[PDB]
Design a protein around this ligand. Structure first.
Ligand code: HEM
Ligand SMILES: O=C(N[C@@H](Cn1ccnc1)c1ccccc1)c1ccc(-c2ccc(Cl)cc2)cc1
Length: 444
């Protein structure tokens, strides 16, 4: 009934060093030996059960919060967002908040986002690269465009005056450094947390000033309105109470914190694969889809007249997933396949491992946009079941618009021998930085 177990040498540390070493091979090794998609590591004296069989994915995403709580595994962000936030609040209360945020991001509000994106990317592009031939670092250049572009989308004219794009990105960085690597459960705000403390206060203060001047204008029936934040102001709690500054501040940061890293990486990988002598066959196929539109795109042609472009962004995520793995605690015993897991254990499901199973994908390491899964429910890049990612629709529309606006004017060329390798150092994994140098050209 119990799952198979791996044997450790030292009692003090369980397979921690092996993790630091590339874990893709490590995890594969085990699966081939114990011949099973389910086993337990027991890391650092603390058992951890991995579910790594495409067939069993539903036994893990389908179950409710009372049986499997997410609050406990992630407890460090708690410290970052605000006090008593998500995972920082009662489930009945938390569940409520997710919904207000979700409504903000919907197809019903994408109407005016497109043309705004093109402007920002063109502004930056025409000033940052000016010579006919130049050398730039892609990974560093996709990060600037992602940040400056969202704000055009979600911040009000008056809110951008008191906060520029550049400055804001710096503010987010300080909070991140608070992240502690190797801070394994279990061990508290440290000096790096002292900076994190300051950053939010400065962000909390500036919010108040924009409100006072907006209300008088909000008074008088100001015509524009439309701010997501404004939409957030109206929100009414179920019992019958309105949101406090503290919480609003928290939600906003959340939105901004989640988007930047993941989208950037996704964009970066997509341009590399696409500029290589090998992947030439599919480079034409793209031009066969972007040489009909005018110089000014509109909502329609990007949502429904760009099907294939969407097939490229997918394969990229599938092959090199930004997020290594998701986890949760077991408040009660749960059945899995032909085995069962006791109570008080830690169970995890890995996108990285699943995307490399031979049964679902014939060749895991190859890059093909026209491939299809042989087993239904294998991919799970954007998550699944009850916990499904929200920014999905938004991130895609933004990523697609960028690709479209760049290949139309510039032609890129990679200097290195072959596509860059992954770097497992950080917690959110993207391509290695020193291999990203590229040379750009210009048509016409
Ligand atoms: C490549 C882009 C993205 C990827 C790969 C991604 C991935 C994921 C994954 C794997 C989960 C579930 C993790 C778990 O089960 O604990 C998730 C959930 C979530 N994501 Fe994303 N996401 C992306 C974009 C975004 C964006 C743009 C936002 C906000 C603007 C966002 C906010 C959230 C939130 C609030 C959840 C809560 C999950 C829940 O409902 O329990 N994500 N995402
Ligand atoms: O950051 C988060 N998630 C991932 C990165 N990510 C990107 C897209 N999808 C996931 C992550 C990245 C790095 C470390 C851990 C997790 C995260 C952000 C916000 C909230 C949240 C929860 C409840 C409320 Cl009401 C509002 C917001 C939860 C999680």
């Amino acid at each position: 009934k119990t799952p198979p177990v791996y044997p450790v040498t030292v009692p003090f540390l369980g397979h921690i060093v092996q993790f630091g070493k590339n874990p893709l091979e490590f995890m594969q090794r085990c699966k081939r030996d114990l011949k099973s998609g389910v086993f337990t590591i027991s890391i650092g004296g603390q058992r951890v059960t991995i579910v790594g069989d495409p067939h069993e994915h539903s036994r893990f995403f389908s179950p409710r919060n009372e049986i499997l709580s997410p609050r406990e595994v992630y407890t460090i962000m708690t410290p970052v967002f605000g006090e008593g936030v998500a995972y920082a609040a009662p489930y009945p209360r938390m569940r409520e908040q997710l919904n207000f945020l979700a409504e903000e991001l919907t197809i019903a509000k994408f109407q005016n986002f497109v043309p705004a994106i093109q402007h920002e990317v063109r502004k930056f592009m025409a000033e940052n690269w000016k010579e006919d031939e130049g050398v730039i670092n892609l990974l560093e250049d996709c990060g600037a465009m992602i940040i400056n572009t969202a704000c055009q989308c979600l911040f009000g004219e008056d809110l951008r005056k008191r906060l520029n794009a550049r400055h804001f990105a710096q503010l987010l960085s300080k909070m991140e450094s608070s992240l502690i690597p190797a801070a394994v459960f279990m061990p508290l705000p440290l000096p790096q947390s002292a900076r994190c403390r300051e950053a939010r206060a400065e962000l909390q203060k500036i919010l108040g000033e924009i409100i006072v001047a907006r209300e008088k204008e909000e008074a008088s029936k100001d015509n524009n309105t439309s701010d997501l934040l404004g939409g957030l102001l109206k929100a009414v709690y179920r019992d019958g109470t309105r949101m406090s500054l503290h919480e609003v501040c928290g939600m906003i940061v959340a939105a901004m914190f989640a988007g930047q890293h993941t989208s950037t990486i996704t964009t970066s990988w997509s341009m590399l694969h696409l500029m290589h002598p090998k992947n030439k066959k599919w480079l034409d196929k793209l031009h066969k889809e972007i040489d009909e539109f005018p110089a000014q795109l509109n909502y329609d042609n990007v949502m429904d007249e760009m099907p294939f472009a969407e097939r490229c962004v997918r394969e990229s995520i599938r092959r090199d997933p930004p997020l290594l793995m998701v986890m949760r605690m077991v408040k009660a015993e749960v059945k899995v396949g032909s085995y069962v897991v006791p109570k008080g254990d830690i169970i995890a499901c890995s996108p990285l491992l699943s995307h490399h199973d031979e049964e679902a994908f014939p060749n895991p390491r190859l890059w093909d946009p026209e491939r299809d899964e042989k087993v239904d429910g294998a991919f799970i890049g954007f998550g699944a079941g009850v916990h499904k990612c929200i920014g999905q629709k938004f991130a895609l529309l933004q990523v697609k618009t960028i690709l479209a606006t760049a290949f139309r004017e510039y032609d890129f060329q990679l200097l290195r021998d072959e596509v860059p390798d992954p770097d497992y150092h950080t917690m959110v994994v993207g391509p290695t930085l020193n291999q990203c140098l590229v040379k750009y050209t210009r048509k016409k």
